[PDB]
Design a protein around this ligand. Structure first.
Ligand code: NAG
Length: 165
């Protein structure tokens, strides 16, 4: 039948404050979705379809945080608003830079499910940080890159394994 999802948008203050709003989605074609990007601060909750649902995907560096979640139960995408600090450190560290070389790259402490060290380059921006595997292997890195460049990703598991060589 229908799936009832939380609904809000950062155009409004609906994410950042208020009673939680509902929206009907067409399941199984659609699911509850929650998309976060903070550098700027874009936040949305509603209906959508991500391949790999239910699940989450995420990436953070020193100055950017992306997170996505998809799920299939009532208001599963609701609750308190997320930021990077909602996620307890997971024990790993990765090098970080924005779109960068060995002459600067600082380690950050990885949080939540973002336990892979990432390097990605777009044909020329380069980014490094902490990522989930689903972020490494999806189309998510191609998105969140300026315009329509050629994207290659490399991820590894192990603290600091994405160091600039
Ligand atoms: C985080 O980034 C800021 C730049 O806005 C920088 O001043 C700071 O040293 C960085 N710290 C870490 C731990 O990455």
């Amino acid at each position: 039948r229908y799936l009832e999802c939380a609904s809000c948008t950062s155009l409004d203050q609906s994410c950042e404050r208020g009673r939680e709003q509902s929206l009907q989605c067409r399941y199984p074609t659609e699911h509850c979705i929650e998309v976060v990007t903070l550098q700027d601060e874009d936040y949305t909750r509603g209906c959508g379809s991500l391949p790999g649902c239910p699940g989450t995907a995420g990436f953070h560096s020193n100055q950017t945080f992306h997170f996505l979640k998809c799920c299939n139960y009532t208001h599963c995408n609701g609750g308190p608003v997320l930021d990077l600090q909602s996620f307890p450190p997971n024990g790993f560290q990765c090098y970080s830079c924005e779109g960068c070389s060995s002459e600067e790259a600082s380690l950050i402490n990885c949080r939540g499910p973002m336990n892979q060290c990432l390097v990605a380059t777009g044909l020329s921006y380069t980014v490094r940080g902490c990522a989930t595997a689903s972020w490494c292997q999806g189309s998510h890195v191609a998105d969140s890159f300026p315009t329509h460049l050629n994207v290659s990703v490399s991820c590894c598991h192990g603290s600091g394994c994405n160091s600039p060589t």
